[PDB]
Amino acid sequence: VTLQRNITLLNGVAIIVGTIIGSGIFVTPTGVLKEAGSPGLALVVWAACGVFSIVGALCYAELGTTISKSGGDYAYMLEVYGSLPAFLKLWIELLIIRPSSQYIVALVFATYLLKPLFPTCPVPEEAAKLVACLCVLLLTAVNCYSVKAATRVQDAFAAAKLLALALIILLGFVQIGKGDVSNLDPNFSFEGTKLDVGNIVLALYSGLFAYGGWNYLNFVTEEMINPYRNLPLAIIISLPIVTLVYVLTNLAYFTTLSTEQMLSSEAVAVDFGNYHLGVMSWIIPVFVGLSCFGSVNGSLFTSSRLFFVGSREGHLPSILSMIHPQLLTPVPSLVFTCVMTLLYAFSKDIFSVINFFSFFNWLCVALAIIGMIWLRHRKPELERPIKVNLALPVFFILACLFLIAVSFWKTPVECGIGFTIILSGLPVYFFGVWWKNKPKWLLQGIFSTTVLCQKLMQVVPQE
Amino acid sequence: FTGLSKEELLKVAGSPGWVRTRWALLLLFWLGWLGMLAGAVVIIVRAPRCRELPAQKWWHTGALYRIGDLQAFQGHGAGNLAGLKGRLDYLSSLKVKGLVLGPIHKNQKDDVAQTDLLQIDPNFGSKEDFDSLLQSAKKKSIRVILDLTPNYRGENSWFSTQVDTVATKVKDALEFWLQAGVDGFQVRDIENLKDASSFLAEWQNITKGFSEDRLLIAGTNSSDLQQILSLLESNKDLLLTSSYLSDSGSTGEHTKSLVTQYLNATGNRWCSWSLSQARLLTSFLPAQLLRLYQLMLFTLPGTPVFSYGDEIGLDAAALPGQPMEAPVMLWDESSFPDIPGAVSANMTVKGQSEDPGSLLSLFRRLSDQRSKERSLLHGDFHAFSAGPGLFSYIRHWDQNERFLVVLNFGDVGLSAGLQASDLPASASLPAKADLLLSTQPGREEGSPLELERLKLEPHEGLLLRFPYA
Numbered sequence: 068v069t070l071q072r073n074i075t076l077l078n079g080v081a082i083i084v085g086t087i088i089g090s091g092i093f094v095t096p097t098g099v100l101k102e103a104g105s106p107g108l109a110l111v112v113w114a115a116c117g118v119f120s121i122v123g124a125l126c127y128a129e130l131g132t133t134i135s136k137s138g139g140d141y142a143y144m145l146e147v148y149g150s151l152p153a154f155l156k157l158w159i160e161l162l163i164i165r166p167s168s169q170y171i172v173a174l175v176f177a178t179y180l181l182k183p184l185f186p187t188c189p190v191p192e193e194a195a196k197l198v199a200c201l202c203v204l205l206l207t208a209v210n211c212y213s214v215k216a217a218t219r220v221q222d223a224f225a226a227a228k229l230l231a232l233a234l235i236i237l238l239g240f241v242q243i244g245k246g247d248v249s250n251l252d253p254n255f256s257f258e259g260t261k262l263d264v265g266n267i268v269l270a271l272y273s274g275l276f277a278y279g280g281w282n283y284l285n286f287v288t289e290e291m292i293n294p295y296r297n298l299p300l301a302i303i304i305s306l307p308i309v310t311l312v313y314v315l316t317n318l319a320y321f322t323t324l325s326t327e328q329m330l331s332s333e334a335v336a337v338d339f340g341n342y343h344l345g346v347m348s349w350i351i352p353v354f355v356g357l358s359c360f361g362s363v364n365g366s367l368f369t370s371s372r373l374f375f376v377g378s379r380e381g382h383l384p385s386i387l388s389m390i391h392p393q394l395l396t397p398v399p400s401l402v403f404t405c406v407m408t409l410l411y412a413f414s415k416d417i418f419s420v421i422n423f424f425s426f427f428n429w430l431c432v433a434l435a436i437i438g439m440i441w442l443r444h445r446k447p448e449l450e451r452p453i454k455v456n457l458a459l460p461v462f463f464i465l466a467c468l469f470l471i472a473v474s475f476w477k478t479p480v481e482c483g484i485g486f487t488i489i490l491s492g493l494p495v496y497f498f499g500v501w502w503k504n505k506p507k508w509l510l511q512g513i514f515s516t517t518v519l520c521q522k523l524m525q526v527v528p529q530e
Numbered sequence: 531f532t533g534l535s536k537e538e539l540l541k542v543a544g545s546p547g548w549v550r551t552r553w554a555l556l557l558l559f560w561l562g563w564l565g566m567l568a569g570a571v572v573i574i575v576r577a578p579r580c581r582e583l584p585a586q587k588w589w590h591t592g593a594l595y596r597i598g599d600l601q602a603f604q605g606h607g608a609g610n611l612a613g614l615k616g617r618l619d620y621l622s623s624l625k626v627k628g629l630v631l632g633p634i635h636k637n638q639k640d641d642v643a644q645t646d647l648l649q650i651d652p653n654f655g656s657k658e659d660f661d662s663l664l665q666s667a668k669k670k671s672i673r674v675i676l677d678l679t680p681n682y683r684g685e686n687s688w689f690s691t692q693v694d695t696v697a698t699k700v701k702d703a704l705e706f707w708l709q710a711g712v713d714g715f716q717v718r719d720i721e722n723l724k725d726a727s728s729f730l731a732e733w734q735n736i737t738k739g740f741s742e743d744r745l746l747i748a749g750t751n752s753s754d755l756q757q758i759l760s761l762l763e764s765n766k767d768l769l770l771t772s773s774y775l776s777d778s779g780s781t782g783e784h785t786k787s788l789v790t791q792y793l794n795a796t797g798n799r800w801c802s803w804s805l806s807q808a809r810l811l812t813s814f815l816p817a818q819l820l821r822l823y824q825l826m827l828f829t830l831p832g833t834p835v836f837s838y839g840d841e842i843g844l845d846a847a848a849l850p851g852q853p854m855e856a857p858v859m860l861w862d863e864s865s866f867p868d869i870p871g872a873v874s875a876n877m878t879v880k881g882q883s884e885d886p887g888s889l890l891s892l893f894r895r896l897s898d899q900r901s902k903e904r905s906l907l908h909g910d911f912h913a914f915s916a917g918p919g920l921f922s923y924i925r926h927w928d929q930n931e932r933f934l935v936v937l938n939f940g941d942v943g944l945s946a947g948l949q950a951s952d953l954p955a956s957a958s959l960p961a962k963a964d965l966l967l968s969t970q971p972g973r974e975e976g977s978p979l980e981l982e983r984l985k986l987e988p989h990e991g992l993l994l995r996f997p998y999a
């Protein structure tokens with residue numbers, strides 16, 4: 068009784084595309100223009116972010132091909148190094164950043180879906196919370212139903228995102244065709260507020276936000292047909308398309324709106340729709356809202372198969388491993404993920420989670436690349452069909468060090484506390500792993516609880 | 531390992547009742563989902579609705595900047611428009627939404643048959659130079675309003691002789707300048723025009739007949755309220771700059787009475803706030819009141835119109851060489867050639883730039899704060915009574931960030947004395963609010979302040995900011 072491989076090349080591309088393009092393209096332009104005054108500088112930094120993501124995805128593809136074990140960073144960084152760092156990584160994923168990701172995306176979806184009913188007014192917070200919770204519940208039910216439905220929904224919503232982006236591009240091209248000037252003189256020429264470390268690194272840091280989410284294919288490895296060749300092909304097909312679409316969309320934005328308008332307004336897509344559409348320009352946020360919906364689904368998918376992997380190594384309670392005998396989906400893992408995604412609705416504030424994620428996400432990738440280099444040094448011919456030159460990984464490590472330094476410079480006190488939380492997993496690690504010969508009553512209670520959960524939810528062990 | 535295998539689980543889980551329990555939980559989950567959806571629908575339907583937008587124009591979103599003497603704006607010896615083309619960056623930094631050229635046509639003396647309103651004076655610039663200046667201004671999103679006064683070198687506003695031919699010349703020139711690309715017109719000293727109401731109505735009708743974004747400014751020299759109302763009887767949409775606020779200065783409640791009476795009489799329409807039609811603020815105010823008035827004019831429901839050099843407190847009574855009607859802009863120590871060294875840094879524009887406490891920094895901060903919030907853009911205005919020597923009001927559009935301005939016109943310090951918040955409307959006054967900036971040294975910003983124990987030093991203004999309640 069094992070999860071059969073169902074994801075194909077098209078679904079593999081769809082997962083990456085729907086995870087990467089969820090919200091950044093519709094919001095970030097304002098920030099990148101605030102940091103980089105010149106629109107040409109913004110386009111240049113967007114291209115730099117794109118090529119940096121290309122480099123990271125390239126090496127990541129090889130890293131995944133070498134170690135075909137399921138699970139993402141929690142597997143590659145567990146095989147290298149030792150058991151202790153892997154549990155810290157998984158505990159950090161379980162605690163804050165991963166569950167908060169779905170809730171934030173769902174809240175954005177709710178707000179931008181209810182925006183047409185409240186154009187100028189701020190949407191009520193209760194309605195947004197209820198709609199986000201409804202979305203999470205529906206999506207975690209659909210995921211528990213069957214894998215094929217989830218793949219179909221992800222493909223459909225990726226297609227919807229591409230259609231919306233193409234509509235934006237064609238509207239921009241049409242307004243160019245009407246004797247436009249492309250704002251060429253403000254473009255490039257004077258940079259504005261450029262600085263050696265003051266502003267360009269801040270613009271780069273803002274730009275890398277919208278390019279995140281490409282590290283998801285590993286989270287679904289061992290469930291796709293022929294992972295040896297389909298995994299790198301999906302990445303090399305998805306990433307350049309996303310980069311060119313981002314560049315073209317930013318170019319379309321900059322030409323049809325004044326710089327001050329973006330520097331003052333927040334929803335650039337809404338203003339674009341109001342200016343061009345001029346009629347029923349209320350669906351624009353709706354599409355954008357849909358552009359978030361599918362994203363959540365993808366995240367939930369890539370969340371569940373992560374925790375399940377942990378349950379195989381013994382780090383997690385053995386309840387998560389069991390799967391439904393007929394449906395073949397990991398119901399307890401999805402229920403657990405949905406519960407801790409819901410639990411973040413009760414928080415009065417939600418932007419406090421960025422302070423730790425901002426540097427954790429970019430230090431873990433560097434740790435993984437160092438692990439890949441260590442694996443290359445330790446023993447060769449560990450089934451490495453690709454065998455990329457050892458030039459990209461070192462440059463990526465150097466760039467990640469600069470990003471960590473920038474994060475330290477920006478939010479020192481915030482970054483400090485974030486890391487402190489990391490140490491909180493040590494007592495849990497000792498109580499769960501280092502401590503095994505527990506009193507009989509504890510084992511009896513744990514066994515009874517797992518038996519009860521197995522009796523309610525019909526799930527059989529992996530083997 | 532810590533659980534039943536497949537065979538044991540399928541043997542035990544098949545008992546009756548256990549099959550029904552999971553089905554019951556599934557139906558309960560679906561029922562809870564439907565209940566959540568129904569609750570969301572109820573919250574959505576039973577909620578307040580938005581207010582209607584006032585159809586924002588281009589001249590409601592920022593102040594206006596006047597240039598009485600173009601020659602003295604960039605110093606003597608350079609009267610071409612290229613100076614303005616190069617200096618547009620300064621005004622863009624000031625973030626004004628308009629620019630009023632002075633009269634540039636030919637006007638030598640009272641010769642009516644020789645003065646022409648269409649030909650461009652060579653010393654000021656050329657026709658293609660004007661086109662280039664207009665193009666550069668439009669690229670910078672700075673819109674140009676051009677002045678049309680046939681006589682500005684003699685004694686009469688228009689001409690001492692019959693004025694009908696003057697009106698014919700003006701109506702001939704309206705289109706000649708409109709198809710040139712200007713974004714508005716201005717006429718001054720209309721108090722010398724016989725039956726000026728009909729002429730103003732005709733010009734307003736003609737200007738609106740080309741497009742909707744066209745604007746007309748009229749300037750008078752009379753502070754009488756009844757005369758202004760009579761002038762606006764048939765020119766409701768016209769913007770009338772006048773000397774209304776110039777009648778009294780440093781008055782604690784007389785200014786409040788003037789503003790409230792004017793707003794009540796005009797019907798709460800859109801108006802223009804300025805002490806004079808073409809003169810500087812320091813000609814009617816001392817150096818200790820500039821900050822208070824610059825704070826007041828940026829938080830009133832209307833368009834503020836300022837003269838050039840009045841964002842740094844330029845004085846026409848501090849240097850004998852400069853004439854009072856045409857002051858010379860202070861760009862550096864070499865700007866004013868006579869008696870070198872008399873110019874000080876704190877009156878120099880370069881000296882007012884880096885200093886955070888300078889007037890220019892205050893003007894820039896107010897300009898930034900004027901054109902982003904809707905409360906200060908098109909929000910409702912409510913003034914309430916306070917202690918003597920104080921003027922207190924509130925700005926609130928529908929739901930956005932509420933602003934509360936308190937000014938101390940008294941010559942001595944006293945407490946706030948906010949007493950009862952008259953006419954709070956929907957925007958209730960909380961006991962806690964922020965303090966964005968202050969007009970006097972001290973009073974560190976960003977921290978919340980308690981209003982019931984506000985001690986106001988003489989000649990101070992506060993711009994408390996508090997959110998929706």
Ligand SMILES: *[C@@H]1O[C@H](CO)[C@@H](O[C@@H]2O[C@H](CO)[C@@H](O)[C@H](O)[C@H]2NC(C)=O)[C@H](O)[C@H]1NC(C)=O
Pocket residue numbers: 731732735736
């Ligand atoms: C000309 O300007 C006048 C100033 O108000 C406008 O007065 C109109 O006069 C015409 C016919 O005499 C009619 O439209 C109405 O009697 C007036 N309408 C209004 C709104 O005042 C007029 O709109 C302008 N153009 C016309 C049509 O004369």
Ligand SMILES: *[C@@H]1O[C@H](CO)[C@@H](O[C@@H]2O[C@H](CO)[C@@H](O)[C@H](O)[C@H]2NC(C)=O)[C@H](O)[C@H]1NC(C)=O
Pocket residue numbers: 721751752753
């Ligand atoms: C014109 O501005 C000055 C400012 O006080 C005043 O001068 C008057 O001008 C009018 C018209 O020439 C004449 O009555 C006299 O020359 C001045 N008399 C007055 C009233 O002081 C006057 O206030 C303004 N014009 C008016 C009449 O309001």
Ligand SMILES: *[C@@H]1O[C@H](CO)[C@@H](O[C@@H]2O[C@H](CO)[C@@H](O)[C@H](O)[C@H]2NC(C)=O)[C@H](O)[C@H]1NC(C)=O
Pocket residue numbers: 794795
């Ligand atoms: C101008 O507005 C004032 C406002 O005080 C009017 O005086 C009155 O005071 C109340 C309270 O504000 C006003 O609402 C009423 O309109 C007035 N009623 C009384 C008690 O007389 C004044 O009448 C207004 N003038 C015009 C032409 O409307």
Ligand SMILES: *[C@@H]1O[C@H](CO)[C@@H](O[C@@H]2O[C@H](CO)[C@@H](O)[C@H](O)[C@H]2NC(C)=O)[C@H](O)[C@H]1NC(C)=O
Pocket residue numbers: 874875876877
């Ligand atoms: C400089 O700022 C001062 C503000 O104090 C103004 O004139 C000054 O007046 C004080 C005493 O009244 C003295 O510092 C000097 O008389 C003036 N300042 C200096 C440094 O000379 C005015 O704003 C500016 N005056 C000058 C001439 O600098």
Ligand SMILES: N[C@@H](Cc1c[nH]c2ccccc12)C(=O)O
Pocket residue numbers: 086087088089090091092168276277278279280362428
């Ligand atoms: N960039 C994604 C958001 C996102 C998904 N997964 C992420 C991981 C890290 C940073 C951002 C994300 C979007 O466009 O909505």
